[PDB]
Amino acid sequence: STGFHHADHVNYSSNLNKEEILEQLLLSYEGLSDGQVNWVCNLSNASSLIWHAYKSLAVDINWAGFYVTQASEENTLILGPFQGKVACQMIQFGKGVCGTAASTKETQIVPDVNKYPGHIACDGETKSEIVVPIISNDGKTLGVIDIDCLDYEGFDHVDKEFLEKLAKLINKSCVF
Amino acid sequence: SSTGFHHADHVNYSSNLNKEEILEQLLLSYEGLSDGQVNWVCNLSNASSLIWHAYKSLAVDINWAGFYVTQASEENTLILGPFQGKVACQMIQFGKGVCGTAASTKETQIVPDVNKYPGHIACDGETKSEIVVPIISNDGKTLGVIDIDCLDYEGFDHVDKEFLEKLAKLINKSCVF
Ligand SMILES: [Br-]
Ligand SMILES: [Br-]
Ligand SMILES: [Br-]
Ligand SMILES: [Br-]
Ligand SMILES: [Br-]
Ligand SMILES: [Br-]
Ligand SMILES: [Br-]
Ligand SMILES: [Br-]
Ligand SMILES: [Br-]
Numbered sequence: 001s002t003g004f005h006h007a008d009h010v011n012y013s014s015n016l017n018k019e020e021i022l023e024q025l026l027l028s029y030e031g032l033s034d035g036q037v038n039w040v041c042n043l044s045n046a047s048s049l050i051w052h053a054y055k056s057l058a059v060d061i062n063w064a065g066f067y068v069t070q071a072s073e074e075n076t077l078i079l080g081p082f083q084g085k086v087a088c089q090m091i092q093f094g095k096g097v098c099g100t101a102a103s104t105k106e107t108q109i110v111p112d113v114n115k116y117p118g119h120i121a122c123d124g125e126t127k128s129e130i131v132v133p134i135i136s137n138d139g140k141t142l143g144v145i146d147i148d149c150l151d152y153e154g155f156d157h158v159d160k161e162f163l164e165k166l167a168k169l170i171n172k173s174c175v176f
Numbered sequence: 177s178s179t180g181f182h183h184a185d186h187v188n189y190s191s192n193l194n195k196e197e198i199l200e201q202l203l204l205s206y207e208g209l210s211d212g213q214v215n216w217v218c219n220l221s222n223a224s225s226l227i228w229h230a231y232k233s234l235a236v237d238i239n240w241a242g243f244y245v246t247q248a249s250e251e252n253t254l255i256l257g258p259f260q261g262k263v264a265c266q267m268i269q270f271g272k273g274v275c276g277t278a279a280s281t282k283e284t285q286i287v288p289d290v291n292k293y294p295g296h297i298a299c300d301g302e303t304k305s306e307i308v309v310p311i312i313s314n315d316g317k318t319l320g321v322i323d324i325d326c327l328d329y330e331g332f333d334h335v336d337k338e339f340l341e342k343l344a345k346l347i348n349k350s351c352v353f
Pocket of ligand 1: 090091092095
C-alpha cells in the first residue's frame with residue numbers, strides 16, 4: 001500500500017512557488033492519464049488539477065475547464081468537464097474567447113472581458129480569462145482549455161506556457 | 177435585450193432556502209440546462225456543478241459530486257465522468273465498492289461510514305460517508321451512477337436518494353449515452 005489516494009495530487013503547500021506547482025500538475029496529469037485514452041476521464045481529472053493548482057497560487061479563479069470540438073458538423077465547441085459554476089453549453093468557432101481560440105488555433109489572454117467584443121459570458125462575475133486550444137496531430141482544434149478569473153488581468157505568459165504544454169499532453173494521451 | 181442572468185446563476189441562490197426548495201430548483205435547472213442538447217458530457221458536467229453547489233448551501237460538507245458512466249466497450253465497467261471535487265479513480269468494476277455495487281445491484285447505496293463498507297474504493301482518503309444513485313436506461317440497464325462524497329459520517333438520507341433518483345431519470349431522458 002502506497003498510503004496515497006488519487007485526491008492527494010491536489011495538495012500544494014503555500015510554500016511552493018508557481019513553477020513547482022505547475023510542474024507537479026503536468027507530472028500528475030501524466031500519471032493519471034497513462035492508463036486510459038478516454039478523454040472524458042482524463043479531462044475531468046485535468047480540470048480538478050487546474051482548479052486546485054490555481055487556488056493554491058492565489059489567482060482568484062472561478063472556473064476551470066474544457067470545451068470539446070463537437071463530433072457533429074461545422075465546428076462547434078460543446079461543454080466538457082469543468083470545476084466551477086454552470087456554464088454555456090455550446091460555442092460556435094469564432095465566437096467569444098473560446099471560439100476565437102478555436103478558429104485561430106492560438107492562445108487567447110483577455111485582461112478584461114467586458115472590453116472584449118463578442119465576449120460570451122457564462123459567469124457574470126468573470127473579469128479576465130485565458131483560453132488555450134488543444135491541437136491534434138493533423139493541426140486541427142480538438143477543444144480548448146478555458147480558465148476564468150474574478151480579477152482583471154489574472155493570466156500572463158507563464159500560464160500560457162504551462163497550458164500549452166498541458167494541451168500537448170492531452171492530445172497525446174486522449175482519443176477524441 | 178439581455179435577461180441580466182448568466183449560466184452561473186443556476187448555482188447562485190440563498191442558503192436560507194429550505195432543502196426541498198433547493199432540490200426542486202435543481203431539478204428545474206437541470207431540465208432547462210439540458211433541454212437544448214442530448215450531449216451527455218455537457219449535461220453531466222453542468223449537473224455535477226448543480227449537485228455540488230446545492231449540497232454546499234445545504235451545509236453538508238461534501239468533497240465530491242459527480243458521475244461514472246458505463247464503458248461502452250464493456251457493460252460491467254464504470255469510467256470516470258464529469259465531477260466537482262478532487263482528482264478521482266478512473267475506472268470501477270461493477271460489484272466493487274460503493275459505486276460498483278450501486279451499478280451491479282441497480283440500487284442506491286447510502287453509506288454512513290465508508291470505512292465500514294466492505295470493499296470500499298477510496299478516491300479521497302478523507303471521504304467518510306457517501307451516496308451513489310444508479311442511472312437506469314429505458315431498457316433497464318445501468319448507464320452510470322451519480323456519486324457524492326462527504327467529509328463527515330452520516331451525511332446523506334433517503335430524501336437525497338429520492339431527489340437524486342428523480343435526477344437520474346431526467347438524465348436518462350435527456351442524454352444519449
Ligand atoms: Br455561439
Ligand atoms: Br468593447
Ligand atoms: Br480546426
Ligand atoms: Br501533441
Ligand atoms: Br434565492
Ligand atoms: Br429534508
Ligand atoms: Br475496481
Ligand atoms: Br439522518
Ligand atoms: Br423530476
